[PDB]
Design an enzyme around this catalytic site. Structure first.
Site, short mmCIF file in Angstrom:
data_model
loop_
_atom_site.label_atom_id
_atom_site.label_comp_id
_atom_site.label_asym_id
_atom_site.label_seq_id
_atom_site.Cartn_x
_atom_site.Cartn_y
_atom_site.Cartn_z
CB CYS A 101 -0.90 0.02 1.27
SG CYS A 101 -2.22 1.28 1.26
CG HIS A 160 -5.89 -1.96 -2.30
ND1 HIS A 160 -4.92 -2.64 -1.60
CD2 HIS A 160 -5.59 -0.64 -2.18
CE1 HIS A 160 -4.07 -1.77 -1.07
NE2 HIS A 160 -4.45 -0.56 -1.41
CD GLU A 161 -6.73 1.67 -4.95
OE1 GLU A 161 -6.69 2.51 -4.01
OE2 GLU A 161 -5.73 0.98 -5.29
#
Ligand SMILES: CCCCC[C@H](CC(=O)NO)C(=O)N[C@H](C(=O)N1CCC[C@H]1CO)C(C)C
Ligand code: NI
Ligand code: NI
Length: 184
Positions: free
Chosen positions: A110, A153-154
């Site tokens: 990340c 993820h986003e």
């Protein structure tokens, strides 16, 4: 023109908040911000441009990572068959997904996390996402594999969720029965 000095790091409260939806049609400023996420993701992937402006390569980015608590995400990733998935969306949401899961065997990194966090990050193998584009088009995207993982993820960032929240806390490398491991 976002650079690494605009990226906030784990520990910053903005990363654990639930982001605010964006009023549509968007204001010129919200369009500017979303566009800026997409431009950073694209540019960060040219190693010459990344070195020149101080960017770190990312295949996706969310507004909260530059301290903007709004529901905006950008994705620019190529799948295993060589197809490009490039998107900048306002108010994205996963409306349905597979029960079957998948995960990158390398684990995930990340931009807001400066350290190796080991372990498999469990994700749905297939998802369907709705959102509105920079030009007002309301899309319904049926995704799978790496592209599906990037969107999860986003979108997670917009709900104040970090990738390591989805790593098994007992044995980070637990092999889930039936789950698709991705990694060549
Ligand atoms: C895979 C889901 C995460 C994609 C988005 C992140 C960037 C990010 O933090 N977005 O909020 C990224 O590019 N992470 C990279 C990443 O995890 N890589 C990119 C290629 C696939 C995977 C490595 O296994 C690292 C290397 C910076
Ligand atoms: Ni669900
Ligand atoms: Ni991230």
């Amino acid at each position: 023109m976002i650079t690494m000095k605009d990226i906030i790091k784990e520990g910053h409260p903005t990363l654990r908040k639930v982001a605010e939806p964006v009023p549509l049609p968007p204001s010129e400023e919200d369009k500017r911000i979303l566009q800026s996420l997409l431009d950073y993701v694209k540019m960060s992937q040219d190693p010459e441009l990344a070195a020149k402006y101080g960017l770190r390569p990312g295949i996706g980015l969310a507004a909260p990572q530059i301290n903007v608590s709004k529901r905006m995400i950008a994705v620019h990733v190529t799948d295993e068959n060589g197809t490009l998935y490039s998107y900048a969306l306002f108010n994205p949401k996963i409306v349905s997904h597979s029960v079957q899961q998948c995960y990158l065997t390398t684990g995930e990194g990340c931009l807001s996390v400066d350290r190796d966090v080991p372990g498999y990050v469990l994700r749905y193998a297939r998802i369907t996402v709705t959102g509105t584009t920079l030009d007002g088009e309301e899309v319904t995207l049926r995704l799978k594999g790496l592209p599906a993982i990037v969107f999860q993820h986003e979108i997670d960032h917009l709900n104040g969720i970090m990738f390591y929240d989805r790593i098994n806390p007992a044995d980070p490398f637990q092999v889930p029965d039936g789950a698709i491991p991705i990694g060549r």
